[PDB]
Design a protein around this ligand. Structure first.
Ligand SMILES: CC(=O)N[C@H]1[C@H]([C@H](O)[C@H](O)CO)OC(C(=O)O)=C[C@@H]1O
Length: 628
């Protein structure tokens, strides 16, 4: 869906220059005051109560203006709401502000962390020092009760506490200036820790992120030792399989994602999963945007939800907010949750009592509202995809493979299984059994579990960099295993392509691949080295092919055994390769008029290098995995 889905709907919950908030004058007096713009949305669930948190930018939408933290809460899933000012600014000047809320929910408590400023008119990373700033922590307590039938709630907000005295003056050399939460919903780890991802500006104005956590419900806080590269900001964190996953805003480049198994002490870039998948615009050289990043359980499966604008317009327009869902292997684009080509921006997502919602910005002429969205259609699609994933994984995991010489052998490998091209194919499309990334086809005829190629450019292109803006197979530049069953149907004139990974760039370069020749020999291709012939094959005979790439090394297996040359380095230097696509057969839209006469079935893709036992299992069970 290229627009908020059929069945879904929204209301303008925080309405620009319309909705009022109970502004408290210096004398305790209270007056309902109109607010120019509502920005920086977060929506969470506290003990069955929806709490929507936001910047109330009273006079203008500008960052350096008079702002307070507004809250709207509901006990009836959005039928009705009450409004509060949860956090007052210092009132030091006409630009005093409390802003950019980051929120953790634990039990009936809300922990809110905001940046507080008194009088500066320029941007926080460019301040001369931290004198105008304070990081404020505020705790809110939700209390329920019920009239005759009807439930009601109140939220009591405490006095802000400055965490500035807890901020180190330096980090491993780095002289600190200010810090603020990463924006949005953060978490309680499974060990009960309060975990805030934060963004830190150093004196020279560099930005980087770290984890600030509490083991005692907010009494004390610690800054973990690890950090992101410089240039990361507005970090969002979630917990996945015993690790923190930190998803960073990165202005002017692709988004960096890190993992930490030790509560932030050590960070490692998520090169084999999520790092660099998402970005700020088609060309990636634009201002980035905040993203929500939340772990949920759908149809019994744990998954991650990620939101971000395509920003086809560029700069801060932030049009076309999308929602993605991933289980750390497959990444599914649920679609566009904003409407048409409206400008959106910062966002929040929440799964509560089996219903999906979003609170996000809409922007016309830099006057901003927050819409509260019921993601009905989206959730239906999501549930269907999750069921597809569980069902195929369980099916493959349940196959009885041959016992090997030492009831069944080891399971058909499913951990790290990203995509699968098998039986379903139609027109110019070879369908991903996992419903995320299809392959594009030309000059093919359907056969059981795959395709037979015949004609110029006969073959399939499984896009990698060619996915474009969002690169869901970006992991392959770091490591992959590509598997397939093949037959060579006709002898080639000289050398013809069968399977591999192509590289972006001039020429027709390959990272790793396999070709075959007129002498009936294999020609494995290892990076840029001369592809010399080895071995022997026979026309028509089915062969199992596996390509593995990890640690910048490449191996090619036929029938479970490595071909000569395997284990060689395929890429040099430290710059990640830039794979354009995986080719199957001899696809082309130009260049040599390649016509590889081969039939390929059951092409499997993993985001790791499979071990030798796993490879043999696949070789032994190849007539068992097809979708039929
Ligand atoms: C404290 C502050 O300025 N926060 C603002 C943030 C920041 O300025 C930028 O990340 C440069 O560091 O930008 C944006 C934004 O719509 O992109 C909204 C935040 O309110």
């Amino acid at each position: 869906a290229a627009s908020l889905a059929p069945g879904s709907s929204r209301v303008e919950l925080f309405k620009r220059k319309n909705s009022t908030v109970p502004f408290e004058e210096s004398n305790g007096t209270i007056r309902e005051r109109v607010v120019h713009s509502f920005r920086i949305p977060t929506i969470v669930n506290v003990d069955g109560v929806m709490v929507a948190i936001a910047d109330a930018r009273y006079e203008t939408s500008f960052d350096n203006s008079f702002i307070e933290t507004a809250v709207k809460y509901s006990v009836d899933d959005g039928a009705t709401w009450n409004t509060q000012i949860a956090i007052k600014n210092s009132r030091a000047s006409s630009v005093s502000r409390v802003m950019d809320a980051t929120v953790i929910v634990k039990g009936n408590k809300l922990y809110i962390l905001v940046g507080s400023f008194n009088k500066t008119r320029n941007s926080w990373t460019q301040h001369r020092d931290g004198s105008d700033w304070e990081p404020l922590l505020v705790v809110g307590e939700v209390t329920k009760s019920a009239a005759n039938g009807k439930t009601t709630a109140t939220i009591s907000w405490g006095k802000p506490v400055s965490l500035k005295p807890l901020f180190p003056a330096e980090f491993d050399g780095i002289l600190t200036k200010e810090f603020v939460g990463g924006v949005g919903a953060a978490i309680v780890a499974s060990n009960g820790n309060l975990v805030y991802p934060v963004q830190i500006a150093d004196m020279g104005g560099r930005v980087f992120t770290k984890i600030m956590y509490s083991e005692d419900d907010g009494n004390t806080w610690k800054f973990a030792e690890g950090r992101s590269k410089f240039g990361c900001s507005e970090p969002a964190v979630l917990e996945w399989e015993g690790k923190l996953i930190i998803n960073n805003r990165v202005d002017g480049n692709r988004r960096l994602v890190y993992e930490s198994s030790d509560m932030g002490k050590t960070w490692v870039e998520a090169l084999g999963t999520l790092s660099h998948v998402w970005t700020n615009s088609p060309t990636s050289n634009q201002q980035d945007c905040q993203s929500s990043f939340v772990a949920v359980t759908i149809e019994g499966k744990r998954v991650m939800l990620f939101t971000h604008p395509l920003n086809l317009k560029g700069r801060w327009m932030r049009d076309r907010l999308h929602l993605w869902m991933t289980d750390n292997q497959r990444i599914f684009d649920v679609g566009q949750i904003s409407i048409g080509d409206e400008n959106s921006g910062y966002s929040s997502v929440l799964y509560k009592d089996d219903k999906l919602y979003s609170l996000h910005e809409i922007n016309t002429n830099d006057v901003y509202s927050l819409v509260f969205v019921r993601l009905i259609g989206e959730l239906q699609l999501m549930k269907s995809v999750v069921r597809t994933w569980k069902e195929e994984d369980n099916h493959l995991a349940s196959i009885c493979t041959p016992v090997v010489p030492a009831g069944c052998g080891a399971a058909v490998p499913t951990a790290g299984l990203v995509g699968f091209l098998s039986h379903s194919a139609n027109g110019s499309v070879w369908e991903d059994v996992y419903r995320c990334v299809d392959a594009n086809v030309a000059n093919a005829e359907r056969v059981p579990n795959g395709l037979k190629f015949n004609g110029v450019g006969g073959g399939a292109v499984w896009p990698v960099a060619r996915q474009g803006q969002t690169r869901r197979y970006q992991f392959a530049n770091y490591r992959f295993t590509l598997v397939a069953t093949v037959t060579i149907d006709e002898l080639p004139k000289g050398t013809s392509p069968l399977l591999g990974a192509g590289l972006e760039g001039p020429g027709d370069a390959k990272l790793l691949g396999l070709s075959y020749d007129k002498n009936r020999q294999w020609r494995p291709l290892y990076g840029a080295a001369p592809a010399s012939p080895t071995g022997s094959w026979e026309l028509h005979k089915k062969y199992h092919v596996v390509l593995t790439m990890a640690d910048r090394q490449g191996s090619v297996y036929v029938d479970g055994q490595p071909l000569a040359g395997s284990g060689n380095t395929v890429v040099r230097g430290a710059t990640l390769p830039d794979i354009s696509h995986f080719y199957i057969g001899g696809p082309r839209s130009k260049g040599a008029p390649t016509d590889s006469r081969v039939t390929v079935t059951n092409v499997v893709l993993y985001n790791r290098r499979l071990n030798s036992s796993e490879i043999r299992t696949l070789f032994l069970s190849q007539d068992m995995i097809g979708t039929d």
